[PDB]
Amino acid sequence: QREGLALMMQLARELKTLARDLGMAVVVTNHITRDRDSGRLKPALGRSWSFVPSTRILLDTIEGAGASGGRRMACLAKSSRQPTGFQEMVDIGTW
DNA sequence: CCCCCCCCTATCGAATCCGTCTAAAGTTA
């Protein structure tokens, strides 16, 4: 089908125009998928949605030692003002 | 041309000896 992709593009356009033409701060959350041929982590909703946002934040859980709790991984996957690929450690149980 | 997942199985293979105790009964000038 095609109507779902068109609806997704229309929603993306509405969000972008609400953010820019009005001067607002919009934050959205998305799921994460595992690629089949390469086996690398990849954002969901496909390539068409891949171009929508401007700043990307990826959250992962630290396996093995330090697992569970708030201890997790925060990374920057896309930005228009910073180089990507950087690493950072954050917690979600100290606030 | 577009976007997301699946699943346990099956037994094997014997070794290694030790440590002594308890005496009894006279006979024939």
Curated annotation (Swiss-Prot):
Cellular localisation: Nucleus; Cytoplasm, Cytoskeleton, Microtubule organizing center, Centrosome; Chromosome, Telomere
Domain of life: Eukaryota
Disulfide bonds: none
Tissues/organs with expression: Expressed in colon, prostate, spleen, testis, ovary, thymus and small intestine. Weakly expressed in leukocytes.
Subunit-level organization: Part of the BCDX2 complex consisting of RAD51B, RAD51C, RAD51D and XRCC2; the complex has a ring-like structure arranged into a flat disc around a central channel. In the absence of DNA, the BCDX2 subcomplex XRCC2:RAD51D formed a multimeric ring structure; in the presence of single-stranded DNA it formed a filamentous structure with the ssDNA. Interacts with SWSAP1 and ZSWIM7; involved in homologous recombination repair. Interacts with BLM; required for stimulation of BLM activity by the BCDX2 subcomplex XRCC2:RAD51D.
Function comment: Involved in the homologous recombination repair (HRR) pathway of double-stranded DNA breaks arising during DNA replication or induced by DNA-damaging agents. Bind to single-stranded DNA (ssDNA) and has DNA-dependent ATPase activity. Part of the RAD51 paralog protein complex BCDX2 which acts in the BRCA1-BRCA2-dependent HR pathway. Upon DNA damage, BCDX2 acts downstream of BRCA2 recruitment and upstream of RAD51 recruitment. BCDX2 binds predominantly to the intersection of the four duplex arms of the Holliday junction and to junction of replication forks.
Disease affiliated with this protein: Breast-ovarian cancer, familial, 4: A condition associated with familial predisposition to cancer of the breast and ovaries. Characteristic features in affected families are an early age of onset of breast cancer (often before age 50), increased chance of bilateral cancers (cancer that develop in both breasts, or both ovaries, independently), frequent occurrence of breast cancer among men, increased incidence of tumors of other specific organs, such as the prostate.
Family, similarity comment: Belongs to the RecA family. RAD51 subfamily.
Record-given protein name: DNA repair protein RAD51 homolog 4
Organism of this sequence: Homo sapiens (Human)
Taxon lineage: Eukaryota, Metazoa, Chordata, Craniata, Vertebrata
Full-protein residues shown: 220 to 314 of 328
